[PDB]
Paper text:
The enzyme inorganic pyrophosphatase (PPase) catalyzes the hydrolysis of pyrophosphate (PPi) to inorganic phosphate (Pi). This is an exergonic reaction and can be coupled to several unfavorable and energy demanding biochemical transformations such as DNA replication, protein synthesis and lipid metabolism. Family I PPases are Mg2+ dependent enzymes known to exist as homo-hexamers in prokaryotes and dimers in eukaryotes. We report structural and biochemical characterization of these two apicomplexan PPases.
We were successful in obtaining crystals of seleno-methionine (Se-Met) labeled PfPPase and hence used single wavelength anomalous (SAD) technique to obtain the crystal structure of PfPPase. The final structure was refined to highest resolution of 3.2 Å with Rwork/Rfree of 0.22/0.27. Crystals of PfPPase belonged to space group C2 with five molecules in the asymmetric unit and Mathew’s coefficient of Vm ~ 3.0. Overall, the PfPPase crystal structure showed simple domain architecture, typified by five stranded β-barrel β4 and β7-β10. The first 36 residues of PfPPase are missing in the current crystal structure and thus the structure extends from residues 37 to 380. An interesting and a key distinct feature of PfPPase is its N region (residues 36–76) that stretches away from the structural core and is absent in both T. brucei and S. cerevisae PPases. PfPPase active site showed electron density for only one Pi molecule in two (B and C) out of five subunits (A–E) in the asymmetric unit. In structural comparisons with TbVSP1 and ScPPase, this Pi molecule in PfPPase closely corresponded to the location of Pi molecule of the bound PPi that is not directly attacked (P1). This observation suggested that the directly attacked phosphate group (P2) of the PPi was first to dissociate from the active site of PfPPase. In the asymmetric unit of PfPPase crystals, four chains formed two non-crystallographic dimers, and dimerization of the fifth monomer was mediated via the crystallographic 2-fold axis.
Author numbering:
A (entry chain A): 37 to 184, 190 to 323, 353 to 380
B (entry chain B): 36 to 184, 192 to 322, 353 to 380
Write the structure that this text describes.
């Protein structure tokens, strides 16, 4: 029972209400603990370690080298772009779910774990309406500075690039799904740019008919308006403030050029990390209107030695 | 505890290690005491929280001052719809940032406010609502009246829903004077559910906001969220987006909606009294504009709705 220091109390019994149903009745996972799939003519495996809502639950990925399954990182070792020309997204939250999973950059082999707020396992406030994940071999490296009295400076989220599937079908937790890029939008808070890639599943019923942000409204109306407003508000119950979203949306080609730049950023972090371990081991309403452009590469920036890299 | 997914990966289901309870209840806003006295429209009322939340007989009873005693009253029938100030009274059923689906029960004695029940279990919203939400008294979307554009539409068969875009969080059960700003329409599943957009009397920008277009200057994106929130809030269950008419009502078209539905309410109460002495893609549906059509005179009011 929750004690409100007011005379009306709250019983807090979870057997008479639909909270548990609301959150978990849309879970979409692989059938078995160890699950083998084939991506880009190669064979890999996803392993569910421990149980959901446990504080050391993680999703491990392996590759079949010979007769054995060797451990791999989904950030480093799964191919960003397929031979088809499509990209692989790593589904971390399935459609309609609330469980805030993330690829842990600071964990060995970058396993997928649940985020933790205030010391407690994090759940979304609202049900997300799209399959949500990250692109491999991408990185919003904060070494690079963006710009717009005197200018305002912006950096990256310091995590891999976020990606959205507007597909109808609910994907699975941890699944690697080939996806086609459609566009992108940006969240600008805390002074850093958090890019969100909008993409469509390879196997969606309208894959070939949708090729830009404007083709969606003909087959899946309002996903673009809903997408922005969802990310605008999804934390309003705790922050009591709306997130800032730039008025400028990227088209399909501006988004594919974004994925590459962040891949090159990823290949500069990995270089900076090897050099650094031989060195010392051997209102704001029109703040949304601004147009942001590259500025300079801070050479006083030191890469995070906490993030695991092979 | 463990949730059955009929698969090998299980769910611990412990509520002490996660932020679910925090997400839902950390923004509850209620009156301090069980019995609370308030003054609305120069009259004196009392509010009684009966029972505890998440129990199967929790309800909010309302009383009025009939000299010498406090008499039971219904918030739907006996609270004044429009005040002498020119303001309307909203009866808050869902607090800002909260999930608990409370409703005025038309089929319950004195129309007490109880928690809704879905599939036999106490109903909670899927997402946190971002505005104070309630209903207008002495209003009724009477299904006797049919609308057209052929395709026919009827009423919600419930009192008019109203939204407060005010910043301040109101209280569960609170009766709040509000100024009307506009309205939007939902067209499922063949009936019109009008949603009135209004602002709290006591909001810091009360006098600066007098239309739906004034909101973006003090509370940006409130109007876009309103449409999208109600568009999807049951999508996790229905797997489909709700339909919302493309036409938004201005301040005067909404006040004419409130009064039109008030006349509907003053026709339901008379028609029920007359009946009881005799005993011995969808894109278009959003673009379509609806107009009135005929009053089905073979319609008999619902005798389950409690009436004094």
């Amino acid at each position: 029972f929750i004690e409100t220091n007011k005379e009306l109390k709250i019983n807090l019994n979870f057997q008479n209400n639909n909270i548990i149903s609301n959150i978990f009745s849309n879970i979409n996972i692989y059938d078995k603990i160890s699950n083998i799939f084939i991506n880009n003519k190669k064979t890999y495996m996803l392993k569910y370690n421990n149980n959901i809502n446990e504080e050391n639950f993680f999703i491990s990925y392996f590759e079949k080298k010979d007769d054995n399954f060797v451990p791999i990182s989904p950030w480093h070792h799964i191919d960003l772009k397929n031979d088809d020309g499509t990209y692989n997204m790593i589904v971390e939250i399935t459609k309609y779910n609330y469980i805030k999973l993330e690829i842990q950059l600071r964990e060995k082999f970058n396993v997928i774990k649940q985020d933790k707020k205030k010391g407690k396992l994090r759940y979304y406030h609202n049900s997300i309406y799209w399959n949500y994940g990250a692109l491999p071999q991408t990185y919003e490296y904060p070494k690079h500075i963006y710009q717009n009295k005197e200018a305002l400076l912006f950096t990256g989220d310091n995590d891999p690039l976020d990606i959205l599937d507007i597909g109808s079908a609910c994907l699975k937790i941890g699944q690697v799904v080939p996806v086609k890029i459609l566009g992108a939008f940006t969240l600008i808070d805390e002074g850093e740019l958090d890019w969100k890639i909008i993409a469509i599943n390879k196997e969606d019923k309208h894959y070939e008919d949708i090729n830009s942000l404007s083709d969606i409204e003909k087959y899946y109306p309002h996903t673009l308006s809903l997408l922005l407003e969802w990310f605008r508000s999804y934390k309003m119950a705790d922050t009591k403030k709306l997130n800032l979203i730039s008025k400028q949306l990227y088209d399909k080609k501006e988004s594919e050029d974004l994925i590459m730049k962040t891949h090159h950023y990823y290949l500069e972090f990995r270089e900076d990390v090897k050099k650094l371990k031989e060195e010392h081991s051997k209102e704001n309403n029109l703040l949304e209107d601004i147009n942001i452009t590259y500025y300079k590469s801070d050479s006083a920036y030191k890469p995070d030695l906490n993030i695991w890299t092979p």
